[PDB]
Amino acid sequence: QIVQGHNQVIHQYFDEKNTSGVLVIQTDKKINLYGNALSRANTEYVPASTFDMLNALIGLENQKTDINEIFKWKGEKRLFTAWEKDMTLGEAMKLSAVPVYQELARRIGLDLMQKEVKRIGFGNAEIGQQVDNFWLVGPLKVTPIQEVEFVSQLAHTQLPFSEKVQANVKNMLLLEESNGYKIFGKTGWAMNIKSQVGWLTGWVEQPDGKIVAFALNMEMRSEMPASIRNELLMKSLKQLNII
């Protein structure tokens, strides 16, 4: 069942950050919705950088790359200074280095990419004719509910990929670790549109191994401080006693 959770306090956290957002939590097969814009949970958005998780899975499964490959920076200035170096697929995951994921997408090629995306059934599963930017500007879109379900399956090694490939992608996603709890995840921000979308999608692995998956989806503005998605997430997870 998908249902609105105990939300008085978290609704207030979203209002206090002057944003419009939803937090989707999946434990077992139960999904709960929190925040001040719950209709966002079933609204389709571009996945932006969050697609990198599925791009990696497809690329590794089909041996178009491996976890030790160094992707070469050819010397051109990039959108961000942090991206201006040779790096592995996993380092590119952490940095959301789009040139690396675009390179990988082109290796995969349109035919294999569309076949895989359809097989997984990610979002609307539409990639169009442009293999190198379909997750950034459309036509591929996905709801927060779909994202939490995807990442929950990754965390449980239930996606229809090899076990080793799934383990290797999970290993690229560790964000924070303390008091026995691990937090894995992936941020995203579609900056170049009228309604900027911010993502933070991942899971908590609790000390006993239990998995609680999350997908935060909110409207971003340029004026927002850098940590805002992580800050709202951690506050909300603490309030729900997930951490």
Distance in angstroms (rounded) separating the CA atoms of residues 147 and 139? 16
Is 107 in contact with 56 (CB distance < 8 Å)?
no
Using alpha carbons only, give the angle 45, 21, 18 rounded to the nearest 5 degrees.
130
Find the distance separating the first CA and the last CA of the chain, reported in whole Å: 23
In this structure, what token pair is assigned to residue 106? 């082109």
Owner of token pair 């503005």: 221
Count Cα neighbours of 56 within 13 Å in the Cβ-side half-sphere: 30
Identify the active-site residue in 20, 39, 49, 236.
49
CA-closest candidate to residue 99, choices 74, 127, 66: 74
Compute the radius of gyration of the chain from its Cα atoms: 17
Is 38 in contact with 224 (CB distance < 8 Å)?
no
Is 9 in contact with 239 (CB distance < 8 Å)?
yes
Owner of token pair 């160094």: 70
**Pairing relationship of beta strands 2-4 and 30-35 according to DSSP bridges:** parallel
Domain ranges of the chain: 1-243
Distance in angstroms (rounded) separating the CA atoms of residues 150 and 141? 13
Is 39 in contact with 47 (CB distance < 8 Å)?
no
The DSSP code for 71 is B
Please state, as a whole number, how many other Cβ atoms lie within 10 Å of the Cβ of residue 45.
23
Count Cα neighbours of 184 within 13 Å in the Cβ-side half-sphere: 24
CATH 3.40.50.720 fits 1-243, yes or no: no
CA distances 237 to 32, 102, 115, Å, are 12, 33, 36
**Pairing relationship of beta strands 211-219 and 197-205 according to DSSP bridges:** antiparallel
CA-closest candidate to residue 117, choices 159, 71, 157, 172: 159
Is 220 in contact with 199 (CB distance < 8 Å)?
no
The sign of the torsion formed by the CA atoms of 1, 243, 187, 71 equals negative
Resolution in Å, one decimal place = 1.9
In this structure, what token pair is assigned to residue 189? 């921000």
Whether 49 is catalytic is yes
Method used to solve the structure: X-ray
